[PDB]
């Protein structure tokens, strides 16, 4: 059986720079002149995967000449001469030397951009939701870079490290930034036993956290 290990999982690169993605099959492929079943695919955000390279080095029509494949034995790598914003997406290699063919785990190509602090906005539960007996406090941290960010909640001053879920958008297609949502969920009862709710976030762009909060005692 063959197992294809693709690296890295995420590849950050500046526009204009070179990018290199590696795939290693657990089985050495044969052929220095007799065809090589190594293919490369790219799946753009929200789209279906598409063929870039086949036979290890041939470019499918439509694929920019910036892309090129190379390899020998167990190692194969896809290369981009100089990255364009258009290359954002997930790239996958494919080893078709045996049945069944195997795909590499995929490499997320991330476009580097200047650092940016998030725009934080907190939101109390809708009156409609309280009527139904539920209480979710939502917090948005939008348009920041890099992706890693710290989000700590505080209720009347006490950190709340439970009941808080997260979700992150993929790299923005317009500005290359990342966005994140954090949702603290509770029952109407639980929610009403306190008045002070805080969404605190510390991002690498500043040592001092960005605090955004509200008190039930207001609108």
């Amino acid at each position: 059986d063959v197992v294809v290990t693709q690296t890295p999982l995420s590849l950050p690169v500046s526009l204009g720079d070179q990018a290199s993605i590696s795939c290693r099959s657990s089985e050495v492929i044969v052929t220095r002149n007799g065809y090589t079943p190594i293919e490369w695919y790219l799946q753009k955000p929200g789209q279906s995967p598409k063929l870039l390279i086949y036979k290890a080095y041939k470019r499918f029509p439509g694929v920019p000449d910036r892309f090129s494949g190379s390899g020998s034995g167990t190692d194969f790598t896809l290369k981009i001469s100089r990255v364009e914003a258009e290359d954002l997406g997930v790239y996958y290699c494919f080893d078709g030397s045996t049945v069944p063919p195997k795909f590499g785990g995929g490499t997320k190509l991330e476009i580097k951009r200047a650092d940016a602090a998030p725009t934080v906005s907190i939101f109390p539960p809708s009156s409609e939701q309280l009527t139904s007996g539920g209480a979710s406090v939502v917090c948005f941290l939008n348009n920041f870079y890099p992706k890693d960010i710290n989000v700590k909640w505080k209720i009347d001053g006490s950190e709340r490290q439970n009941g808080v879920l997260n979700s992150w958008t993929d790299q923005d297609s317009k500005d290359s930034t990342y966005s994140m949502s954090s949702t603290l969920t509770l029952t109407k009862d639980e929610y009403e036993r306190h008045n002070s709710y805080t969404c605190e976030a510390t991002h690498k762009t500043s040592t001092s956290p960005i605090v955004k909060s509200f008190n039930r005692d207001e609108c």
Partner: protein
């Protein structure tokens, strides 16, 4: 032009069966190898099966004996009969044609969604996310909609029927207690809302749901 459209996806309970279809056009159907490839949540791609011009079929071991790939050269249709479905079979299924011979996979269809679970189909609850007043005096204002408790995926969200494209962030759903919840935020100039109407449009085809929710300020 070469075209391939998958169909037949839906919710199915473990142990059940479902047959997927892949309608083709724009090429001599009989001449090419056709394959089904699936993609799971972890965004991982998994080759599932293929059938070549000569009639031979091939399957991945995790699917052999359960899934049956077949084609009707007469009606230009490719199929994938699934049986003894397992939770791990949940994924987006695409069909793709060989570029030539049995080389490459091109013109992938948009794919059809298959969800294997015992959970029932339930609509989402839509809640408005409005500013807790706060004078603002700021150039931009951020609004949003919390879409809670639905199943199965997916749910689409638009604002003002698509009129508001910029400043939109729709977050990926999270599965909690076999129920999905996601959110969407939109950011417009303070001179746009509340003077003009801002409505999020939520869709949940599974439950034939199409709901509109107007964001109104929290009176003070």
């Amino acid at each position: 032009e070469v075209k391939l459209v998958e169909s037949g996806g839906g919710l199915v309970k473990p142990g059940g069966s479902l047959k997927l279809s892949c309608a083709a056009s724009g090429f001599t159907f009989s001449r090419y190898a056709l394959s089904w490839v699936r993609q799971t949540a972890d965004k991982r791609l998994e080759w599932v099966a293929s059938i070549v011009s000569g009639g031979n079929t091939y399957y991945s071991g995790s699917v052999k004996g359960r899934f049956t790939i077949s084609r009707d050269i007469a009606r230009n249709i490719l199929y994938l009969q699934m049986s003894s479905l397992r939770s791990e079979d949940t994924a987006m299924y695409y069909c793709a044609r060989a570029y030539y011979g049995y080389v490459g996979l091109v013109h992938w269809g948009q794919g059809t969604l298959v969800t294997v679970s015992s959970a029932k189909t339930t609509p989402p609850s839509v809640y408005p996310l409005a500013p807790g007043s706060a004078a603002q005096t700021n150039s931009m204002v951020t609004l949003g909609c919390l879409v809670k408790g639905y199943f199965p995926e997916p749910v689409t969200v638009t604002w003002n029927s698509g009129s508001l494209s910029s400043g939109v962030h729709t977050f990926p759903a999270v599965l909690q207690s076999d129920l999905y919840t996601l959110s969407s935020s939109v950011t417009v100039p303070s001179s746009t809302w509340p003077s003009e109407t801002v409505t999020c449009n939520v869709a949940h085809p599974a439950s034939s749901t199409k709901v509109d929710k107007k964001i109104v300020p929290r009176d003070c």
